[PDB]
Each structure stands twice: as C-alpha cells, then as structure tokens.
Amino acid sequence: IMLMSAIMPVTVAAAAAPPGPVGSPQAVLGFGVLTVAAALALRFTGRRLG
Amino acid sequence: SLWWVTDAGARFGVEDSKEARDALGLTLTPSLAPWVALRLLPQGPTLSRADALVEHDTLPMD
Amino acid sequence: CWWWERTAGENRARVRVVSGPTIPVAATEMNKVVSLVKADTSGRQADQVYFGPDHANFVAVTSESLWWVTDAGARFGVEDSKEARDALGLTLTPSLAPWVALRLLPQGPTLSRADALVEHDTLPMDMTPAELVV
Amino acid sequence: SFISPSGQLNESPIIADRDSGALYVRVGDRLYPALNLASARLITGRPDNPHLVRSSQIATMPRGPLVGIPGAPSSFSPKSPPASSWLVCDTVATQGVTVTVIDGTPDLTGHRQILSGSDAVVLRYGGDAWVIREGRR
Amino acid sequence: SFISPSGQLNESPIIADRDSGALYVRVGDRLYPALNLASARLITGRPDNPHLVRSSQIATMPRGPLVGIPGA
Amino acid sequence: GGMVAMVFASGSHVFGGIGSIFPLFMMVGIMMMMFRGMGGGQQQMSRPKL
Amino acid sequence: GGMVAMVFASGSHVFGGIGSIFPLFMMVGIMMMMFRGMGGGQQQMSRPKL
Amino acid sequence: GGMVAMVFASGSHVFGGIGSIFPLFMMVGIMMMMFRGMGGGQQQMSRPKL
Amino acid sequence: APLVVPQPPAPRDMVPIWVAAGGLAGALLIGGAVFGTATL
Amino acid sequence: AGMAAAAHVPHTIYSPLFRKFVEWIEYLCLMPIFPLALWLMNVYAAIRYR
Numbered sequence: 001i002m003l004m005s006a007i008m009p010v011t012v013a014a015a016a017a018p019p020g021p022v023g024s025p026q027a028v029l030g031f032g033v034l035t036v037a038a039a040l041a042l043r044f045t046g047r048r049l050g
Numbered sequence: 051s052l053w054w055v056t057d058a059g060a061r062f063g064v065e066d067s068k069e070a071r072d073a074l075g076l077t078l079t080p081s082l083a084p085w086v087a088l089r090l091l092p093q094g095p096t097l098s099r100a101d102a103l104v105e106h107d108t109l110p111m112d
Numbered sequence: 113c114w115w116w117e118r119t120a121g122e123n124r125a126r127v128r129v130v131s132g133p134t135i136p137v138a139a140t141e142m143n144k145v146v147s148l149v150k151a152d153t154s155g156r157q158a159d160q161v162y163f164g165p166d167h168a169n170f171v172a173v174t175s176e177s178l179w180w181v182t183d184a185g186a187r188f189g190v191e192d193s194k195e196a197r198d199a200l201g202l203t204l205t206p207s208l209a210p211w212v213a214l215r216l217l218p219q220g221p222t223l224s225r226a227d228a229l230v231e232h233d234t235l236p237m238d239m240t241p242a243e244l245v246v
Numbered sequence: 247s248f249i250s251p252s253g254q255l256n257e258s259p260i261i262a263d264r265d266s267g268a269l270y271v272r273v274g275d276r277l278y279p280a281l282n283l284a285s286a287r288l289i290t291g292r293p294d295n296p297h298l299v300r301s302s303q304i305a306t307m308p309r310g311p312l313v314g315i316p317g318a319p320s321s322f323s324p325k326s327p328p329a330s331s332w333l334v335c336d337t338v339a340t341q342g343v344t345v346t347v348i349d350g351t352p353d354l355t356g357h358r359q360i361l362s363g364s365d366a367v368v369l370r371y372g373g374d375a376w377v378i379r380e381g382r383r
Numbered sequence: 384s385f386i387s388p389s390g391q392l393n394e395s396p397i398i399a400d401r402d403s404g405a406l407y408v409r410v411g412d413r414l415y416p417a418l419n420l421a422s423a424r425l426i427t428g429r430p431d432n433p434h435l436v437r438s439s440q441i442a443t444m445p446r447g448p449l450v451g452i453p454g455a
Numbered sequence: 456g457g458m459v460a461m462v463f464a465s466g467s468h469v470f471g472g473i474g475s476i477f478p479l480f481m482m483v484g485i486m487m488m489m490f491r492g493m494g495g496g497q498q499q500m501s502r503p504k505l
Numbered sequence: 506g507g508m509v510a511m512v513f514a515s516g517s518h519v520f521g522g523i524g525s526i527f528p529l530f531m532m533v534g535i536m537m538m539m540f541r542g543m544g545g546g547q548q549q550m551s552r553p554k555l
Numbered sequence: 556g557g558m559v560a561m562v563f564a565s566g567s568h569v570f571g572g573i574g575s576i577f578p579l580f581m582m583v584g585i586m587m588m589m590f591r592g593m594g595g596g597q598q599q600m601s602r603p604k605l
Numbered sequence: 606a607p608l609v610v611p612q613p614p615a616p617r618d619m620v621p622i623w624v625a626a627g628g629l630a631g632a633l634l635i636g637g638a639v640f641g642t643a644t645l
Numbered sequence: 646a647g648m649a650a651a652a653h654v655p656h657t658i659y660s661p662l663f664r665k666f667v668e669w670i671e672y673l674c675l676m677p678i679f680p681l682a683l684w685l686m687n688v689y690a691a692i693r694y695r
Contacts, residue, residue: 014628018621025621029628036636043640055349056319058416058446060233074284075293078324087332090347092233095315102288104241105278105311107149108186108220109454112236144308183309184279188455200421201430221452228425229608231448235317244289244313246273247695248524249464262404267420267433269404283404296404316453320405320416411611426608450608458508458527467517472571473563477508479579488538495546547599 003045007037052080053088054097061091065098073099116210125210137162146185148218149242158216161185172206173214181217189222196225255303260286262296263304269296270304271313278310283321285314390435397423399433400441406433407441408450415447422451 015030042049052064054076064070071077074097095101113136118125130136137145145162163183171179178190180202190196197203200223221227259272260283271280271289280286287293333348354360361367366379376383390401396409397420408417408426417423424430459478462469470478509520509528520528544551559578562569570578683689 014632017628018624020618020621025625028625029632032629033632036632040636040639044643054319057321058448062319069291070288073288073291073293075287075322076324078326081326081330083330083332087334087347090334090345094234094317095237097284097288097315097318099288099291102285102313102315103244103246105149105244105313106238106241106454107151107218107311109238109312109316110236111221111453146309146311149311184311185309195428196425199425199428199430201424220454223421223425223452223455225425228422228450228452229610231450231606231608232317233448235449235453238316242311244273244278247693248461248519252694265432267399267404267406295402312454317418317449321400321403410608458531461519461524461527462512462517465517465519467512467515467519469512469515469517472575474511475575476579477511481508485535488535492538492543495543496549547597 003041004048007034007041010037052076053083055091059091060094061088062094063096065096067098070098116213118208120208135162137164148185151218151240156216157218161217168207168209170202170204170206171209171214173209173211178202178206179214180223185217186220187214187217188220191222191224196223199225252303255299258294258297259290259292260294260296261299261304263301264298265301273310276308276310277304278313281312281314281316282318284318288315289313389437392436392440393434395431395434396427396429397431397433398436398441400438401435402438410447412445413447414441414444415450418449418451418453419455421455425452426450 011030011034014033015026017029018025052066054062054064056062064074064076113130115128115130116125117128134142141164145160147160148158150157150159169181171181173179178192180188180190182188190200190202256272260269261272261277262269269280269283269286270277271286272278273289280289283296286296327350331349331351333352335346335348337344337346359365361378361381364379366377368375368377370376388401392398398407398409398414399405400407406417406420406423407414408423409415410426417426420433423433459470512520559570
C-alpha cells in the first residue's frame with residue numbers, strides 16, 4: 001500500500017514541471033513516468049500483478 | 051443593352067453581335083434588370099472581338 | 113556584332129567584334145526570334161530579342177542592382193532585401209551582364225512587396241498599343 | 247508510349263502550362279501569353295476552356311508580347327433563374343449611411359416585414375422631410 | 384482519383400480552379416482573385432505553385448476585389 | 456489486352472464483331488493450356504486434415 | 506498471325522519496327538507452354554520428387 | 556461462317572453486340588460435341604513405344 | 606487602395622516542448638538502466 | 646545494437662514462426678534492387694517519352 005501510494009506525488013511532480021498554461025506537453029512526460037514507475041515496481045516486487 | 055456581372059462585383063458590357071455572343075458562349079436569353087439598381091456597380095472595359103486583337107509590351111499603372 | 117564574354121570570377125571580360133552575312137544564329141533557330149512592340153521611338157530600344165542556348169534569366173549589373181528577364185523580352189527590377197528574395201525564390205547567385213546591352217530591353221514595374229498590397233475595381237487602359245495580325 | 251506519344255500538340259488553341267498555370271494562346275505558328283481567359287476566347291473565336299500541356303513542350307515554340315484586355319473577367323458560367331429580383335438598401339448608423347445592393351430573392355424572416363397597410367417611415371433629404379407609404383415618397 | 388482527377392482545399396494559400404484556370408489567393412478567411420503568379424507569391428510570402436481545387440468548392444467562400452501588380 | 460488497346464489508340468478500330476472474334480476465341484485457348492497443366496491429379500493433405 | 510495480318514491489311518502499320526515486340530513475345534510465350542510445360546497423370550515423376 | 560458472311564454482303568449488318576451473341580455462343584456448342592466424340596483414353600499405344 | 610492583411614500569429618513556445626521531449630528521454634533511459642543491469 | 650545482438654542471440658530460444666520470418670527478410674531485400682536501379686538510371690522515363 002505504501003509503495004503504490006508514492007507513485008502519485010512523483011507523477012504529478014513531473015507532469016507539472018513544464019512552464020506555461022497546462023496542455024499537451026504536460027501529458028507527454030506525466031503519463032510517461034507513470035508508465036515506467038508501474039512497470040518497474042512490478043518486476044522487482046513480483047506481487048499485485050493485476 | 052447586354053451586360054455581364056462578375057462575382058467580384060464589377061460589370062462589363064457586351065457588344066450585341068453574333069461573333070461576340072458566340073465567342074464568349076453567351077448564345078442564351080438574358081434576364082431583365084432595372085437601371086436604378088444596376089447603375090451602382092463599377093464599370094469595366096467593353097468586351098468585343100476588335101478590342102482584344104492588340105499587343106502590349108508592358109502595362110502602365112496610373 | 114559587338115560581343116561581351118565573361119567567366120565567373122574573372123576580373124575582366126573579353127570584348128570582340130563579329131561580322132557576316134546574317135545575325136549569328138543557326139538557320140534551324142532563325143524562325144524563333146521575338147519581335148518587340150517598341151513604343152519608344154528614340155534610338156534607345158531594341159527591335160528584336162533572341163534567347164540562345166544556356167541563356168541567363170536572373171542577372172546583376174555593376175551598389176549592384178538585380179533584374180529578372182522574361183521570355184517575352186521584358187525586364188523587371190527585384191528588391192535586394194530578404195523579404196523580396198525569400199518570397200519569389202531567387203536565392204541562388206545571379207549572373208553578370210553589361211549595362212550597355214541590358215538597358216535595351218523594355219522596363220516593367222519593380223517587384224516590391226510594399227506595392228503589391230493593393231486593391232482595384234478596374235484597371236487603367238494602355239495607350240498606344242500594337243495590332244495583333246492573324 | 248503508343249497510347250500517348252510526345253508529338254501530339256495543337257489539339258486546341260487555348261493551352262495552359264501544366265506546372266506554372268500560365269495561359270497561352272496560339273495564332274499562326276507562334277504562342278502569345280494572354281492576360282486572361284476572356285480575351286483568350288475573343289482572340290481565338292472558340293468557346294473552349296484551357297487544355298493542360300507539359301511545360302517542356304511550350305519551350306520549343308516561338309514567343310510574342312502580351313495580348314488581350316487587362317482586368318477582364320476570368321470565368322464564365324451563364325445562369326438563368328425563374329424570376330429576376332433586385333434590391334437597393336439603406337442602413338443608418340448611430341449621421342452616416344451605407345448602401346447595399348442585393349441580387350436574388352430576399353430573406354423576409356425575423357422582424358423584417360413589408361411596409362404594407364398603414365405602416366410608414368419618415369426620412370430627411372435636401373432639408374425636406376419625406377413620408378414613405380404605398381410604395382411612394 | 385486517376386480516372387477523373389479533382390482536388391480539395393488544404394493549408395496552402397495559392398489555389399486555382401480545376402476547370403477554369405483562374406488564380407486566387409487567400410487572405411485570412413477570404414479569397415481574392417489575383418492578377419498573376421508573381422503578385423500571388425509576393426503577397427503570401429511562400430515561393431510555391433498553384434494548387435488545383437474543385438470549382439464547386441471555390442464558389443462557397445467569400446470574395447473581394449482584384450489584387451496585385453498588372454502585367455507582372 | 457495491350458496488343459488490342461494499342462490498335463485502338465492508332466484509330467484503326469478494326470475490332471467489333473468480325474474482328475473481335477479472333478481475340479475472343481484466342482483468349483479461351485490460353486486458359487485451357489494453363490488449366491491442363493494443373494489438372495494432373497487429385498489428392499489432399501491440407502492443414503484442416505493434418 | 507491472322508490478327509497481325511488483319512491490322513496490316515487495314516493499314517494501321519502500328520506494329521512496324523519496335524512496335525512488333527508485343528506479337529513476338531506472345532508467340533514465344535505460347536510456344537513454351539505447348540512444347541515443354543509439365544507431364545500428365547501418367548508422368549508422376551518430376552524434378553521436385555526425383 | 557458462310558451463313559454469317561452472306562448476311563454482311565446483303566448490308567443488313569444486324570450482327571455486333573446484341574446480334575453477335577447468338578453465333579458466338581452457338582460456335583462453342585459444336586466444339587463441345589466433338590470433345591465428347593474423342594472420349595475415353597488411357598490405352599497408351601504409340602509408334603514410339605512399340 | 607491598400608490591402609488590409611491580418612496580424613500574424615505569434616509562434617509557439619519551444620521551451621515546454623524541449624523539456625517534455627527531454628522528460629521521456631530521461632525517464633526511459635533511467636528505467637532501462639535498472640532493467641538492463643539487473644540482467645547481470 | 647550489433648554488439649548487443651551478437652552477445653544475447655547465441656543463448657536464447659526462438660519459436661519456429663520467428664526463425665521463418667528472418668529468413669524471408671533476405672528475399673524481400675533482394676527483390677527491389679533491379680526495379681529500383683533502373684529507376685535511378687531514369688530508364689522508365691526515357692522509354693515512356695521515347
């Protein structure tokens with residue numbers, strides 16, 4: 001539960017980094033880091049596969 | 051008299067002669083119009099076979 | 113005929129004189145000389161123009177000035193600025209030509225962006241035109 | 247190559263450069279660049295439309311100076327409606343007016359209405375005041 | 384598309400009528416008939432060639448008076 | 456088909472009726488000659504049976 | 506050959522010179538199928554099985 | 556062929572398209588009967604085998 | 606008479622695009638390294 | 646990428662459907678050479694405009 005909860009703050013932190021009004025460029029790296037974080041946690045934890 | 055009205059708003063006159071009518075492709079019956087309304091559009095040069103048989107080096111710009 | 117000849121980068125052109133029974137064009141091409149209208153009756157303008165093989169369209173003259181010559185024999189001035197060049201194309205470097213010859217072709221208005229930006233309902237008529245004979 | 251060879255030129259007297267869109271007209275054996283389609287028809291005498299030709303062919307034919315009427319119309323499409331309708335309109339600002347000419351059937355929807363019956367309107371011209379009704383001033 | 388060619392409007396600003404050859408130039412949301420290719424390039428700022436467009440398409444957009452340098 | 460088309464573009468238009476009978480009959484001959492070569496036998500070991 | 510003769514009598518003269526390459530290759534292509542080709546039912550042996 | 560040719564000499568020229576379909580299809584029927592006539596096979600005697 | 610051209614539109618900002626493109630470059634390279642090294 | 650492929654390929658298993666796929670890449674590469682070389686030499690344009 002603790003590990004899973006940590007991915008959200010890390011994700012929005014990266015998504016908000018680009019300057020100016022929010023739009024297309026925020027989504028590119030926002031969902032990117034979310035993709036890598038989940039895939040990475042899965043291999044080394046080996047649990048909660050679903 | 052016969053006239054042609056372009057999409058851009060200008061009006062051009064057509065000489066009523068068999069050769070001018072057929073060259074442009076206006077062998078057809080024209081629609082009526084009143085002078086009070088038609089006179090308000092700007093008038094261009096006249097269309098006639100004699101006027102077009104001329105050569106120019108370059109055009110002026112008054 | 114007076115002849116001017118030059119190779120790119122040479123400091124000076126070669127000037128020569130030629131004579132013969134007919135203008136120096138092959139008999140196979142003799143039939144495509146252009147005959148100008150010549151509205152200027154003074155001796156300052158040519159009667160005919162011919163464009164041979166390997167002719168030049170975009171030309172510069174001796175501070176330098178740029179001119180564009182049409183196949184119909186008319187010359188137009190072109191602005192030196194980036195806007196005018198970039199819009200028409202003409203990015204390549206122009207060929208050289210001598211003013212004593214180039215001035216013989218009739219002149220049109222210069223192609224400047226600043227004067228193209230105009231509207232008209234009707235255009236002015238051309239005085240002193242010439243007959244087209246069939 | 248057999249279905250469409252290179253030598254088939256002179257199919258019609260009005261030709262256009264397939265690449266540059268330029269318009270040319272043929273007289274005798276020469277090609278003259280024309281100012282517009284209207285003057286190309288009148289010079290030739292045929293009610294045709296330009297035929298597209300490959301730019302490599304037109305460079306082999308002798309030139310000539312420009313020809314035609316400058317600024318003449320560039321497209322023709324005769325039309326005949328069932329009835330002819332024209333309107334002259336005046337609209338006043340709020341000390342200033344603009345004049346509009348309408349050709350065709352008007353749109354009478356909304357509050358627009360014919361000035362029939364006892365309806366009227368009053369306007370000024372040349373110092374005098376004029377009352378409009380029954381289609382007269 | 385090969386049997387009976389046609390065309391459609393795109394981003395390009397210099398267009399011509401598929402069957403009448405007339406030259407038009409777009410300025411904002413409005414089409415202006417242009418006197419020649421030279422002034423059309425000069426006005427728009429793009430060194431390019433005219434794009435052939437279906438004649439029934441050109442009729443739907445608004446117009447304006449003639450533009451350019453005569454005889455260029 | 457190319458040989459036939461090439462003749463029409465020349466304007467001879469000799470085909471139609473009397474003429475068309477030659478290419479019409481000739482077309483059948485090719486199909487028989489290639490069909491005859493494939494009709495050499497009948498047995499199957501197709502994926503659905505294997 | 507009849508088609509070529511029929512067009513030549515008609516006067517098209519389109520097949521003269523290089524134009525003749527169409528009738529020529531067809532005649533050769535027919536020749537390969539009729540004389541060589543492949544064996545029938547009584548000739549089960551062939552390069553792929555031998 | 557004789558029956559067909561005699562009509563052209565009279566100038567009625569009724570054949571072509573609509574009309575030609577009868578003689579065209581009728582010709583196939585004759586070939587189809589001679590084929591059944593040469594029926595059978597597999598005897599395989601021949602001068603080169605003897 | 607003179608022609609009224611429309612005012613030209615301002616060009617889009619390149620800084621947000623470059624950091625966003627750099628963001629994926631960074632994230633994928635970082636994630637790949639921990640995956641690859643663990644194979645050893 | 647070449648060194649990466651050289652180091653990992655000798656110690657992994659690949660199913661027949663993939664091994665059969667790399668074989669066909671060779672043939673797909675050989676086929677376009679002649680059609681492309683003649684295009685680069687401008688031969689097709691030379692012939693179409695004889």
